[PDB]
Structure formats: C-alpha cells, structure tokens
Coordinates of C-alpha atoms in Angstrom, one line a residue:
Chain A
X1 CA -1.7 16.0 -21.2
X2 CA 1.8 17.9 -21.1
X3 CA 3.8 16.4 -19.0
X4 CA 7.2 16.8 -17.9
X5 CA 9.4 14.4 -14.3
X6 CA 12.2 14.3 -13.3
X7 CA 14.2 11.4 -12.8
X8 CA 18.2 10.1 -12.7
X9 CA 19.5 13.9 -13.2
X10 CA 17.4 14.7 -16.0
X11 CA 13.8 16.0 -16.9
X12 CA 12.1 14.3 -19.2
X13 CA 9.2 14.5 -21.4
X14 CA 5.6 12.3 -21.6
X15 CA 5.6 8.5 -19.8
X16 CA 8.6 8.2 -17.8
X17 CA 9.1 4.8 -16.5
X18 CA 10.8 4.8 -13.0
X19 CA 9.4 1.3 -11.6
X20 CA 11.5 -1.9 -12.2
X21 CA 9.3 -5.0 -12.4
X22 CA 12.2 -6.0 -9.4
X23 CA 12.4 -2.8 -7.5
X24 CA 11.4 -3.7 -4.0
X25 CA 8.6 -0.2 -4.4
X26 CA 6.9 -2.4 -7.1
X27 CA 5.8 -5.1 -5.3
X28 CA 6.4 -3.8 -1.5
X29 CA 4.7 -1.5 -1.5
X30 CA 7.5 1.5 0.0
X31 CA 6.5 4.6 -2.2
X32 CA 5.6 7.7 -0.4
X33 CA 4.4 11.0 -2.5
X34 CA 2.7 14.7 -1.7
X35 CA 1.0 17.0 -4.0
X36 CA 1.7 20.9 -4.9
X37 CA -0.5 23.1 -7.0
X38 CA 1.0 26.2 -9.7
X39 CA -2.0 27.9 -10.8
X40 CA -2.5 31.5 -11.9
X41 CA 1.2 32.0 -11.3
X42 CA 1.4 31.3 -7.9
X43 CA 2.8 28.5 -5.9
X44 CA 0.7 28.1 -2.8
X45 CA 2.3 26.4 0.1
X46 CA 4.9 24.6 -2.0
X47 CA 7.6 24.4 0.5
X48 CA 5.6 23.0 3.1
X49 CA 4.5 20.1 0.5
X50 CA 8.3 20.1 -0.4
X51 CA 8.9 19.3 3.3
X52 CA 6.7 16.5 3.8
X53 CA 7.7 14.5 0.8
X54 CA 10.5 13.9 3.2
X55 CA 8.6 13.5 6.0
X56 CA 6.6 10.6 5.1
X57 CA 9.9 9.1 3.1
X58 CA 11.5 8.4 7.0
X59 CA 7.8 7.4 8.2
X60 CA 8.4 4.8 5.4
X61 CA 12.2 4.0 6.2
X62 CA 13.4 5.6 3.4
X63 CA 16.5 7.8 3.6
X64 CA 15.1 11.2 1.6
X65 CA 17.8 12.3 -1.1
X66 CA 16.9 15.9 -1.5
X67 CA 16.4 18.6 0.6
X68 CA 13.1 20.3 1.0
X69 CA 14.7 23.4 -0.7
X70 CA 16.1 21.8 -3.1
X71 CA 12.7 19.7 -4.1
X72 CA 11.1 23.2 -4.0
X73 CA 14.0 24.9 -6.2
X74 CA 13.8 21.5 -8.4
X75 CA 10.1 21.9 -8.7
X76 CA 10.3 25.6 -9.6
X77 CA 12.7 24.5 -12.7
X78 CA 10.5 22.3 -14.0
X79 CA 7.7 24.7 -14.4
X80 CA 9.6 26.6 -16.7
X81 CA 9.6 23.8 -18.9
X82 CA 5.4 24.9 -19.6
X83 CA 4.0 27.1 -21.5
X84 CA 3.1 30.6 -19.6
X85 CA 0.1 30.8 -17.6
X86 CA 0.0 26.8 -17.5
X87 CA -1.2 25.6 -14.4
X88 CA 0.5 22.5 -13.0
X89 CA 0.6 19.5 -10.5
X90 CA 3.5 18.7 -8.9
X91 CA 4.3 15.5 -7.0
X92 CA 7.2 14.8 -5.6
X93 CA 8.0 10.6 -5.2
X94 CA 11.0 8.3 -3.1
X95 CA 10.4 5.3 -3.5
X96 CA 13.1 2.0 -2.0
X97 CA 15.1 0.1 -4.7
X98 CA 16.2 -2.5 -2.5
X99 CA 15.3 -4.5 0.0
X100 CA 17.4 -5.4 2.9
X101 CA 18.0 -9.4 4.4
X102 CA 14.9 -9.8 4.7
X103 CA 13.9 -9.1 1.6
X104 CA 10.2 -7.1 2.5
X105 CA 11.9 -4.1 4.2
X106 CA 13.2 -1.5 2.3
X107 CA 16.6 -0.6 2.0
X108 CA 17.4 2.7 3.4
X109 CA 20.2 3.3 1.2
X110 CA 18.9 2.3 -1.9
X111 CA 16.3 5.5 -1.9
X112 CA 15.5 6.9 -5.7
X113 CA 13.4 10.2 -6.5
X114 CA 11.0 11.8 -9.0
X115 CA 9.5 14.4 -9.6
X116 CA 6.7 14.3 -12.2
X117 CA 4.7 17.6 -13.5
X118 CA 1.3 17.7 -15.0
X119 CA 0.0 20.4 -16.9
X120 CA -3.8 20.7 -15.4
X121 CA -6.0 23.2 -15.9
X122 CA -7.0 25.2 -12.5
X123 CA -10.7 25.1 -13.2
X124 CA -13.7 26.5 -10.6
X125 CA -15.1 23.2 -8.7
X126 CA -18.8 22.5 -9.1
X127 CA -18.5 20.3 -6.0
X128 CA -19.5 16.4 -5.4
X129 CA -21.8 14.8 -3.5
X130 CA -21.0 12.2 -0.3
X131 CA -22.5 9.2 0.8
X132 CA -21.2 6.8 4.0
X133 CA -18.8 4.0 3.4
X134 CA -18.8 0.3 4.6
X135 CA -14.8 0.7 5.1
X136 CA -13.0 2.8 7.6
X137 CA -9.8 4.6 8.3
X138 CA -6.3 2.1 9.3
X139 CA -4.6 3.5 12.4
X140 CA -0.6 3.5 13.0
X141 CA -0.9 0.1 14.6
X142 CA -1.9 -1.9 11.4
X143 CA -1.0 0.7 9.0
X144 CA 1.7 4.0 8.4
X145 CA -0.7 6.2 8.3
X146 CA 1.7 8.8 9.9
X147 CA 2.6 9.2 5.9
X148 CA 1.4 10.3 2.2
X149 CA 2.3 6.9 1.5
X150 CA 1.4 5.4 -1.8
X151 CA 0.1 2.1 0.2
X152 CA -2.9 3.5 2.5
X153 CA -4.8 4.2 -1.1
X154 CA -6.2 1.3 -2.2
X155 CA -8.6 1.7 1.1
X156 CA -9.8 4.8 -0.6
X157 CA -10.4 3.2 -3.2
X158 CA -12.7 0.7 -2.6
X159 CA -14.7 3.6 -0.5
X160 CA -14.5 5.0 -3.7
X161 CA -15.9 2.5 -5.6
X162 CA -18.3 1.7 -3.0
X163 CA -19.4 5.4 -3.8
X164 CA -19.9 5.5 -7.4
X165 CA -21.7 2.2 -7.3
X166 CA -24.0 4.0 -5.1
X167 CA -24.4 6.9 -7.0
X168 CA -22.3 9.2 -5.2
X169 CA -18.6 11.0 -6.4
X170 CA -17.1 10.6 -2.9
X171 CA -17.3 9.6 0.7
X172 CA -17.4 10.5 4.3
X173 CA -14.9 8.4 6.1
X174 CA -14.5 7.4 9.5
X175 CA -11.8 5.9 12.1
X176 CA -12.2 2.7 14.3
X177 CA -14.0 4.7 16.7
X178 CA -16.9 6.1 14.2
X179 CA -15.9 9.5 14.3
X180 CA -15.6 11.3 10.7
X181 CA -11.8 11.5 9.6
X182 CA -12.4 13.1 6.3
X183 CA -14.0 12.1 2.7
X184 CA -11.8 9.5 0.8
X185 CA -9.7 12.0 -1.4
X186 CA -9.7 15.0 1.1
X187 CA -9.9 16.8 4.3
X188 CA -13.5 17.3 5.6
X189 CA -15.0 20.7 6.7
X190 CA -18.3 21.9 7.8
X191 CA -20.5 24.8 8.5
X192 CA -23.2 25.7 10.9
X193 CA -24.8 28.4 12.5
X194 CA -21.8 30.3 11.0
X195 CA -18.9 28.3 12.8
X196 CA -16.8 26.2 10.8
X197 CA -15.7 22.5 12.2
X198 CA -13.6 19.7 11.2
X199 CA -12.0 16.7 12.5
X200 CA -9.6 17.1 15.2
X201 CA -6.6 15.4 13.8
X202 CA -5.5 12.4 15.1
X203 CA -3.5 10.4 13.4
X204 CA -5.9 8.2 11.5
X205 CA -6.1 10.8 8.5
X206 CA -3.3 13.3 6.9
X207 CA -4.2 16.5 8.6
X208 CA -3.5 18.2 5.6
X209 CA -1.4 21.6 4.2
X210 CA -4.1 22.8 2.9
X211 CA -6.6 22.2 5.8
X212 CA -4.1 24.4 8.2
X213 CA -3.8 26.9 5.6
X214 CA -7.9 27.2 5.7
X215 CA -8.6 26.9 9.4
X216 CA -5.9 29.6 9.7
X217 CA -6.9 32.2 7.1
X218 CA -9.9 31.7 8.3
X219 CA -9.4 32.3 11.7
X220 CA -7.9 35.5 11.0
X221 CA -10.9 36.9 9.0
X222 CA -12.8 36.7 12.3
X223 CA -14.2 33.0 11.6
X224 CA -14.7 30.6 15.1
X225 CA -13.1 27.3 14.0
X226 CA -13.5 24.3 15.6
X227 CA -11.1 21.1 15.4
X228 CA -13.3 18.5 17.1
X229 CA -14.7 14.9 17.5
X230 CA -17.6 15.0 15.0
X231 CA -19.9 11.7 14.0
X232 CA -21.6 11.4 10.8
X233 CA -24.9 13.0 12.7
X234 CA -22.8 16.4 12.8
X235 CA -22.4 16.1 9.1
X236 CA -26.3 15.2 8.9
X237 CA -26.8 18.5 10.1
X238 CA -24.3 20.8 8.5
X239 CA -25.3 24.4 6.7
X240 CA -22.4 23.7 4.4
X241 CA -20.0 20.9 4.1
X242 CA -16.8 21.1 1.5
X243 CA -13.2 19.8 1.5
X244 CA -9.6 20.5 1.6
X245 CA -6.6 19.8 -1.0
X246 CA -3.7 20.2 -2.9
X247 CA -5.8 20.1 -6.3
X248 CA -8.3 22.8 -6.2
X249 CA -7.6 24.2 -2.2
X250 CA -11.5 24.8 -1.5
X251 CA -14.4 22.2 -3.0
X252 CA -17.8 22.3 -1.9
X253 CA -19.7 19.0 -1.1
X254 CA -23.5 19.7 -2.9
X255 CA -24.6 16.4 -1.5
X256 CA -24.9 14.1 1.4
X257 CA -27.1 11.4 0.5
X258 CA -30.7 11.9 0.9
X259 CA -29.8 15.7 2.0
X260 CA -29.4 18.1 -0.9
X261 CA -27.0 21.1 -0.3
X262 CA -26.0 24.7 -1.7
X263 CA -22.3 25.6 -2.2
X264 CA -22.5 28.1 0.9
X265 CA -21.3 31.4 1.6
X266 CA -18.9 30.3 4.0
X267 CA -17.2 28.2 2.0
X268 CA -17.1 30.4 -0.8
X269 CA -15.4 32.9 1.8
X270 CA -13.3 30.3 2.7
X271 CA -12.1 29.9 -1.0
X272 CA -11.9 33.6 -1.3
X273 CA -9.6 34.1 1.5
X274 CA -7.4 31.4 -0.1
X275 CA -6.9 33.1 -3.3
X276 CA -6.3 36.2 -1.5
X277 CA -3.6 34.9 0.3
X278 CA -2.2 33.2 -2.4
X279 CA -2.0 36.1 -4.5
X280 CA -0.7 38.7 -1.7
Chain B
X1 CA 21.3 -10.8 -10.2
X2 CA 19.9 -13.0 -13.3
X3 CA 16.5 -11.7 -14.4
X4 CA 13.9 -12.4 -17.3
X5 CA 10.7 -10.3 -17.4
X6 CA 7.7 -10.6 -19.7
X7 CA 6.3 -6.9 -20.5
X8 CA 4.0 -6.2 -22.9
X9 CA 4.0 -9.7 -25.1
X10 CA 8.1 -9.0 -24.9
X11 CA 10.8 -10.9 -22.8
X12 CA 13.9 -9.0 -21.6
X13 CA 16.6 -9.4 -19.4
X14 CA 17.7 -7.3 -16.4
X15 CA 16.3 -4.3 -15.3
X16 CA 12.5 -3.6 -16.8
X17 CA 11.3 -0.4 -16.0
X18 CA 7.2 -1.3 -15.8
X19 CA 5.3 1.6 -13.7
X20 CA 5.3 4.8 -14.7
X21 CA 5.8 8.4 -13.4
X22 CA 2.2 8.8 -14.2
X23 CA 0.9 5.2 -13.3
X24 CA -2.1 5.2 -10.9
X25 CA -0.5 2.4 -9.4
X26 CA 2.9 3.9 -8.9
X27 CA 1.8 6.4 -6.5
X28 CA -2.3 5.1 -5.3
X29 CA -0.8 1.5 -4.7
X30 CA -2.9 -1.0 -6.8
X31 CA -0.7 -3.5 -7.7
X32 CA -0.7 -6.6 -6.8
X33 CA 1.5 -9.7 -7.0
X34 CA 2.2 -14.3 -6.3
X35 CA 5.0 -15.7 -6.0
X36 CA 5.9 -19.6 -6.8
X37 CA 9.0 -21.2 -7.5
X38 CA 11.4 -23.3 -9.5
X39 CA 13.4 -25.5 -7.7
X40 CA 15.4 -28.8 -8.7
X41 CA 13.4 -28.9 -11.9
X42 CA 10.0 -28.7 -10.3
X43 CA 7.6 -25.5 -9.9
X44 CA 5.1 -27.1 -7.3
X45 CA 1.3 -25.1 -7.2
X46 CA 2.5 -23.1 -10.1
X47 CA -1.1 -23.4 -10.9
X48 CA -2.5 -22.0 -7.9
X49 CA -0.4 -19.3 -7.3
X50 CA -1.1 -18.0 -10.9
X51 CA -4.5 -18.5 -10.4
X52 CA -4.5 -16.4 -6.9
X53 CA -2.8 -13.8 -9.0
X54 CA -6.0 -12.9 -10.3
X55 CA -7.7 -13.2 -7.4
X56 CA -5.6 -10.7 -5.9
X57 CA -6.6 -8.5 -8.9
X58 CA -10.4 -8.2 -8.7
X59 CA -9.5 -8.1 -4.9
X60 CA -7.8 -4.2 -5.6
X61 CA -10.7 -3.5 -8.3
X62 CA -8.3 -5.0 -11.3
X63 CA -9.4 -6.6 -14.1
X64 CA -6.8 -9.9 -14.7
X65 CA -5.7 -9.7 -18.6
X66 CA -4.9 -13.3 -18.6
X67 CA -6.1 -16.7 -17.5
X68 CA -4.4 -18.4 -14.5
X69 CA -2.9 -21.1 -17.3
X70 CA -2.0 -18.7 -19.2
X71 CA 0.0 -17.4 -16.8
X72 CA 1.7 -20.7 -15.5
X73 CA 2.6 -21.3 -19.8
X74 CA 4.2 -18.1 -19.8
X75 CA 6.1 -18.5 -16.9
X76 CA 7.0 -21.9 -17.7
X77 CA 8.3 -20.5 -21.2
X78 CA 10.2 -18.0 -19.5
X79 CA 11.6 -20.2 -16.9
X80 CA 13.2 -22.4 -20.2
X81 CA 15.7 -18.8 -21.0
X82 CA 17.6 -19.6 -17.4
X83 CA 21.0 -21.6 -17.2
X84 CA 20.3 -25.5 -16.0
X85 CA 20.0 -26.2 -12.2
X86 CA 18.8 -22.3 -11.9
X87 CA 16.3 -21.7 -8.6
X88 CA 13.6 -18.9 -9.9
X89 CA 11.3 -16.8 -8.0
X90 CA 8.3 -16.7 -10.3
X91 CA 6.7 -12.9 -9.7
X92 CA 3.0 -12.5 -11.6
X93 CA 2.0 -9.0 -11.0
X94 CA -0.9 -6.8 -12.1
X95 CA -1.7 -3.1 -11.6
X96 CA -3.9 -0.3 -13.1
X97 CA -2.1 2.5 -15.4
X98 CA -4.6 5.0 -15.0
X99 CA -7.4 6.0 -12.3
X100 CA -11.4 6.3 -12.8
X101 CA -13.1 9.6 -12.5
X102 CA -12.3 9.7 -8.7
X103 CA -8.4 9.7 -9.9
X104 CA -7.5 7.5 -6.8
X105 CA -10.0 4.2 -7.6
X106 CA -8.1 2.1 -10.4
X107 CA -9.8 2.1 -13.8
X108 CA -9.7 -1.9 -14.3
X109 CA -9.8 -1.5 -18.3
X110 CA -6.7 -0.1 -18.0
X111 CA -5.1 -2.9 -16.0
X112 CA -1.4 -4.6 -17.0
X113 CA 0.3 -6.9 -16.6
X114 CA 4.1 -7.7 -15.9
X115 CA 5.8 -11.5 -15.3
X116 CA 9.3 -11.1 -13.4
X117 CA 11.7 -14.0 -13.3
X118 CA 14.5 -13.6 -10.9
X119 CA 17.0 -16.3 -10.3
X120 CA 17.3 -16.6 -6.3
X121 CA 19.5 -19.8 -5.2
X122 CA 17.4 -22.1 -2.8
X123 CA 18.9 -22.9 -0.2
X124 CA 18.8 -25.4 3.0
X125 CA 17.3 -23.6 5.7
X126 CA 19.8 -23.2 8.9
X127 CA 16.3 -21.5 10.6
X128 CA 15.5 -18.3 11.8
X129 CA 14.3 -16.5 14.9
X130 CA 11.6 -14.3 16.0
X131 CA 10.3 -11.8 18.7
X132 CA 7.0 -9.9 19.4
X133 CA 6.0 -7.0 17.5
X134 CA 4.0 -3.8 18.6
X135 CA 2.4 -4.1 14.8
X136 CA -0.4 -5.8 14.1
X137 CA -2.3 -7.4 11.4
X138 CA -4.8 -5.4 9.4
X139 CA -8.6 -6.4 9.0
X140 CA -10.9 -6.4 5.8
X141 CA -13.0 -3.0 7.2
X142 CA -9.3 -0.7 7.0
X143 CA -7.7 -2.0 4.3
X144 CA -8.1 -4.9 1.4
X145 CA -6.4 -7.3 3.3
X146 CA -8.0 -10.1 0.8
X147 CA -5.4 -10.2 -1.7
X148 CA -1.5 -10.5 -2.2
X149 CA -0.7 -7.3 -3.0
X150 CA 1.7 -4.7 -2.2
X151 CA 0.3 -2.1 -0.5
X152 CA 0.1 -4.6 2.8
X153 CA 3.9 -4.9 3.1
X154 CA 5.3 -1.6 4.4
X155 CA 3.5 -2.7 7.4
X156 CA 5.5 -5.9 8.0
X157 CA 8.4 -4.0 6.9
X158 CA 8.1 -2.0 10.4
X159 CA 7.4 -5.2 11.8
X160 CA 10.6 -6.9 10.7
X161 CA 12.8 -3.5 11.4
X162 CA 11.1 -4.0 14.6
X163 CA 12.9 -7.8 15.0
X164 CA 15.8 -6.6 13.9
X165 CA 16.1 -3.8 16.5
X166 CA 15.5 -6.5 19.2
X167 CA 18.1 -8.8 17.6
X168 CA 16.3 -11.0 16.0
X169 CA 15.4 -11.9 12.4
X170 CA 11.9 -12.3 12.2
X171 CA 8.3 -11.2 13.9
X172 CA 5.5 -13.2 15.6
X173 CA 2.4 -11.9 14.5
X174 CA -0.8 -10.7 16.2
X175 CA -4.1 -9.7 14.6
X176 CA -6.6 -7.1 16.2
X177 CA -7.6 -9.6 18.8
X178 CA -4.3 -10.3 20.0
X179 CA -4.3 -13.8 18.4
X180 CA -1.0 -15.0 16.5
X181 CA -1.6 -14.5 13.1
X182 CA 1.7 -15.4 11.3
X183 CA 4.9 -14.3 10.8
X184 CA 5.6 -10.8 9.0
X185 CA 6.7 -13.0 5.9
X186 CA 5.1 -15.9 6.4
X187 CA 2.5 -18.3 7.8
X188 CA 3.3 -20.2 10.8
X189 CA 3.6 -23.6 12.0
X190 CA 3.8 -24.7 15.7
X191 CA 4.4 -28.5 17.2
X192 CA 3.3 -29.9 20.7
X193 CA 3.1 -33.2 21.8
X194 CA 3.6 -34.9 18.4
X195 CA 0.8 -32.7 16.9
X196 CA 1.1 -29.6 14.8
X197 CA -0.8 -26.5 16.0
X198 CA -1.8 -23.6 13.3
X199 CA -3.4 -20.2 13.6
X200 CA -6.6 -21.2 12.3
X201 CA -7.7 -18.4 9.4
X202 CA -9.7 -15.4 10.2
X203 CA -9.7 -13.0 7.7
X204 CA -6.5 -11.4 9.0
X205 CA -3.6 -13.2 7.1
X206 CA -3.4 -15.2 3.7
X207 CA -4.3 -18.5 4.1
X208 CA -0.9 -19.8 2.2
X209 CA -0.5 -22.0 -0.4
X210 CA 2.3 -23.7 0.5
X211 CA 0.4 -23.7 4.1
X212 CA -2.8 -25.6 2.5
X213 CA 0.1 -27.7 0.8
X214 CA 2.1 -29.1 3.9
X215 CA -1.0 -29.5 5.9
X216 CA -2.5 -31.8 3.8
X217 CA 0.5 -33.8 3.4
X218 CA 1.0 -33.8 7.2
X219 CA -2.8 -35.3 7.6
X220 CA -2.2 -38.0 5.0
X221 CA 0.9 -39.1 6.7
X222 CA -0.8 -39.7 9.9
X223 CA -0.1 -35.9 11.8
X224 CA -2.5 -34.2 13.3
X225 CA -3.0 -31.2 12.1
X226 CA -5.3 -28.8 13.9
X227 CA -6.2 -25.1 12.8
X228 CA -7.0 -23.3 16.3
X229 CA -6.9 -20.2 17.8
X230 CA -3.3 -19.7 19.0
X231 CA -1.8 -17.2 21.6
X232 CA 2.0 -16.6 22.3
X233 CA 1.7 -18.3 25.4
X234 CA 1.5 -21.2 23.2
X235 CA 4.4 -20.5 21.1
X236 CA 5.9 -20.1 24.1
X237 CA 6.0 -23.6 25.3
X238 CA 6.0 -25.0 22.3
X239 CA 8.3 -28.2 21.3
X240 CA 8.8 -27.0 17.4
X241 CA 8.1 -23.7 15.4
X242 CA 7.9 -23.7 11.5
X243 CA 6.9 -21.5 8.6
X244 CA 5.8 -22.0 5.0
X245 CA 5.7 -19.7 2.6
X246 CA 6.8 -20.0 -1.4
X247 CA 10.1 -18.6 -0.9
X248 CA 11.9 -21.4 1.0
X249 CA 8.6 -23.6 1.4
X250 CA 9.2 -25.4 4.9
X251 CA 11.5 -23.3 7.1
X252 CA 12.3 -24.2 11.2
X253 CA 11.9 -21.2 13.6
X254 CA 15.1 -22.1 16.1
X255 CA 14.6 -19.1 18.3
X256 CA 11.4 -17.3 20.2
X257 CA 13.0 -14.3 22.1
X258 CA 15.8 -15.9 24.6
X259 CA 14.1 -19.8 24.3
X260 CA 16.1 -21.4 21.1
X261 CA 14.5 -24.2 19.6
X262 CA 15.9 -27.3 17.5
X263 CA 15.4 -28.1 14.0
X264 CA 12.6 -30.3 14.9
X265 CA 11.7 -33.6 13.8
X266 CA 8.1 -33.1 13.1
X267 CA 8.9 -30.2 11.2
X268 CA 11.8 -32.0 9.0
X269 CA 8.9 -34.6 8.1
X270 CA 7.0 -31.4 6.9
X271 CA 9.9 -30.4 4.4
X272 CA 10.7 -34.3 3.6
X273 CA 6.9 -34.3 2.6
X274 CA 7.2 -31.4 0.6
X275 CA 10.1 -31.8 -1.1
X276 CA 8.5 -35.9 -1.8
X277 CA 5.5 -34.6 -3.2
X278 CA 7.4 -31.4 -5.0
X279 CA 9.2 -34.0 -6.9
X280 CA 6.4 -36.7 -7.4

C-alpha cells in the first residue's frame, strides 16, 4: 500500500491527484508511461526504462521535461523514502496539459511529469494460463503504437476481460496479419526442442526491456534464440511458453487452453540467468 | 478560463484535480467522455449526449454511477453557477480508479464519475479547411472504437499535426477501406447538386448526435439526405463541405487542399435549421 510520486517539485505521500477534470490528458487521451522494478536491492535496467519514458512522450507529441538521468537519479531518491529491503514499482508519467487550436492535439509546451512509487512485494510467479482473443493488435496507421502510451490499453483490456470470462488469466494476442504479437500484459516467449522463440518485433507490440534483456542473457549462456513470425499453431506446440516484464522479469504460462503445461526448465534458466545478472 | 466541476457530490471552481497518480485510468486509459452545449439559453440533446455518456462507459467495461437524467439535472444545476449569456461546454466523464485482478482490465465497481463545466464563447463560424491524412480510422477488432472516449484521440491528434504541417486546419478522414470516414474532430457533411451526401456509418466513426440532429431536420425540410459510401474523389468535386459536431454544431469546410469552397447555401440552411429547432 505504501506509496510515495512525485509531482510539481515535491514527493508526496498516498493518492496524489495530478489529472485536472480540464487537462487535455484527461479526456484526450495524451499520457504516455513505462515501468521499472527495485527488488532485492537491485535496480534492473532502470536507465533504459528511464529512457523510454521519453521516448514514447515525443511518439505522443509531448515535449519530455527530464532527462533520462535525471528520471533515473529522481527515481533512485524516491526509493529512499521506503523502508529497507522494500521492493518497489516505479513508473515514470508526461502527460499534455493543453491542447493547441485545435483543441484535440496536445500542446507540446504544456508537458507535466510524475513519478509515482509503489511498494510491491517481489514475490516468485506461479504463472497464468492463456487462451486466444477475439481482438487483435492496432498498427501505427490507426494507432501510436510506436509508444507505452496510456491509450493503446483499453484494447488489452477487453482481451482481458474476454479472458477471465473464459476462464483464463491472460491472452495470446495477435496483429492484423494473425501472427502472435505477445499475451495482453507482456511479451511472449516459447520453448521447443530446447530453442527459445518469440515474436520478431514489428511494430504492432512494445518489443520490450525486458524481452532484450532475456533473449540476450540468454544467448550468452549458449541458448539458440529465435525472433521470428510465429502463428498461434507454434504456440500449440510449445515445450514451454512464459512471458516478459517489468513486474516480475520471467513468468511462466501453465496453460494454453485445452493444453496443460509445466513451468519448464528453460524458463526457469531463463529466470535464473536474470537474477544473476541483476545481482552481478 | 471560467470552470465549474462536480466531483464527488461537490461543485468547485477552477482547476479540479480528479485522476490520480495511482488511478487505473490515469495511466491504462479507461476514461471516457460527451460533450453538449449551452448556447443562447438552450442546451439542445443534452439528453442524449448524457445518455451516450454511459454508453461509452459499459463500452470500456465501466459501470455508469448515474442515470442519463441524472446527469442532464446536474448539469443543468451546474450550468445555473455561470454569469448570464455564458456559452458552456458540458464535459460528463467516467473512468475506473482501480484495475481487476489482471491490473490493466478496469474494475467497473470502482468506476467515478466527474461533470466539467467550461465556459467556451460560441462563436460564428468563418469555416475551416482540410487535407488528406496518412492516419486512418480504427476498427472494433484493434481497439474499442464504440464509445466516446479518450483513448481514440491521440490518433486524430497526429492526424490534425498532420493538417497543420500541410497548412491546413483540419483532416479528411479515411477508414481501413479507404472510404471517408469523417473529419479528425468531427463528422462530415458534403453537398452536390442540391443534395447532401454523408459517409454512411460503418463501425469506424461515431455516428454523431448533432449529425442524427441536422439530418433529420434537413429531410423534414425537403433535402435529400443520403448516407452512402463516400470517396475523396467525391469531396473533390463537391459543391459544399460541412461538419457537425457539439462544439460549434453546423460548421462550413471552405477549403479541400488548393480548391476553396464558399459558405454554402445548403449548408447555412443546415445551421438556420439547427439553430430554429435549438431554440424551438
């Protein structure tokens, strides 16, 4: 529950309100966000998450106000406001004020910024199960998808929903072109005959921190990994399947539909190598 | 800059600080939003905007605290705490605080509500002109296109940075297919040969009320009105261009690229109609 953002030059403690019910965010729709992770004293890949806060604040025409040191240096003062050994979520936010002329486009200019902390416990995943959804992924075209933008959620969402009607935790989620993009929280991953794939990236999903930190540790432990066009048939036929993220790095998937399935070795090595890393 | 919000069962003035740091819709995107107006005294389909309002809401997995009359009293209320001859833009909006199980899907128990009241001066339309746009319309199977809310905005946002960068204030529309849509604020209007020519709905844009509004007035004053499948080639050679939308309700489009266009006199019937009815 311990909480701590920052916001107008100050942390501050519990519910912060940042939102006006007339900031052009509220009801256009113009905040972007990321997600980094302090658990068991480490920081794992904080300045790259620092870094594409700003990122996806110019994919959303936003004008970023910080630095991605100083959001990083920002972010490491705020964890001294927890206990010790308090394991903590940090997400960086820039959001638009203002709109310009016309109104539904953000004003640059007008960019604000907060950074809000959550004390979370960094507990060892019992995975989640997957099941298809009737939705798909946007593309740049009719979406910016090129961004960890607050807007592209609601799809996942639905899928979401769609899931736990159906008696499922999450679900596998594909582009236009029916190839598996990811589940609807998280990069995807599979397993079989002792190679590793995933999606290739391309563009329709984030191809995410975490993902790259994986594939590459990975990689250097003597692991063949693929980044490749895979359909939901791959997934059909995968020794292991778990996901990528900010939250809790390595999570394996224990169910696709009908198909029952083990939290694997190789993900468990994948995991391990994580820590590892994280640690050295 | 005059502003009246109702926030939980309390009106205030100014700036109301609504979502939180911590919100799930502040950084997953779920709330959603009407708009109607006061102008000249009258608040024309206050009813139906407030009653879309909720629409929207189950539309993004909310669950509407209030009634769509209760709504229009309340705003009706509120719009009493404004100096006389004051033009209002009436803002309903509704949003989840917290997230399910999944984090991401909105937990509708936990839905708000917020009414914003901002005095913006109506004025008499001198027209506005568009150009193409590389953006596109979303569809119902990537995102929840259904519903007035404000995670479909930053899209037209490019869309109108995209005008702007050609010069121009405004965007004509396409959907998937490559059929006009609408504007990137607004629905559109188009006249040839005495009769007035409207993309005919598909799922891709909202079918407006104050579109619903002038075409029935058009039909009952003898104007054909037909809802077909337009192109730009038929924007192109078109006699008048028009848009509706609640903001300015009947509004001339005097410019397509390097063809101007007059104020038109089928689409000054359209306003004359409105603003006859408006006041009836």
């Amino acid at each position: 529950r311990a909480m701590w953002t920052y916001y107008k030059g100050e942390w501050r403690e519990g519910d912060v309100r940042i939102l006006g019910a007339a900031s052009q965010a509220t009801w256009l729709g113009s905040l972007v966000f990321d997600g980094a992770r302090l658990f068991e004293g480490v920081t794992p890949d904080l300045d790259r998450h620092s870094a594409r806060a700003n990122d996806s604040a110019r994919a959303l025409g936003l004008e970023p106000t910080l630095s991605a040191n100083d959001i990083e240096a920002l972010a490491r003062e705020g964890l001294k406001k927890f206990a010790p050994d308090t394991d903590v979520y940090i997400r960086p936010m820039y959001w638009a004020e203002e709109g310009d002329a016309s109104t539904v486009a953000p004003l640059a200019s007008s960019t604000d910024f907060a950074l809000c902390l959550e004390a979370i416990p960094m507990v060892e995943p019992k995975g989640f199960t997957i099941t298809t959804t009737s939705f798909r992924r946007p593309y740049l075209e009719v979406m910016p998808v090129n961004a960890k933008a607050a807007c592209l959620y609601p799809n996942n969402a639905r899928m979401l929903r769609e899931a736990k009607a159906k008696g499922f935790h999450n679900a596998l989620v594909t582009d236009v072109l029916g190839n598996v993009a990811e589940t609807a929280t998280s990069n995807v991953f599979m397993v079989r005959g002792g190679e590793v794939f995933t999606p290739v990236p391309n563009g329709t999903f984030l191809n995410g921190i975490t993902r790259q930190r994986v594939i590459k540790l990975l990689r250097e432990a003597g692991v063949s990994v693929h980044e490749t066009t895979l359909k939901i048939e791959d997934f059909r036929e995968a020794d292991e399947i778990f996901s990528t993220g900010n939250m809790s790095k390595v999570v394996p998937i224990i169910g696709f539909d009908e198909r029952k399935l083990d939290y694997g070795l190789v993900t468990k090595r994948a995991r391990a190598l994580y820590w590892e890393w994280a640690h050295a």
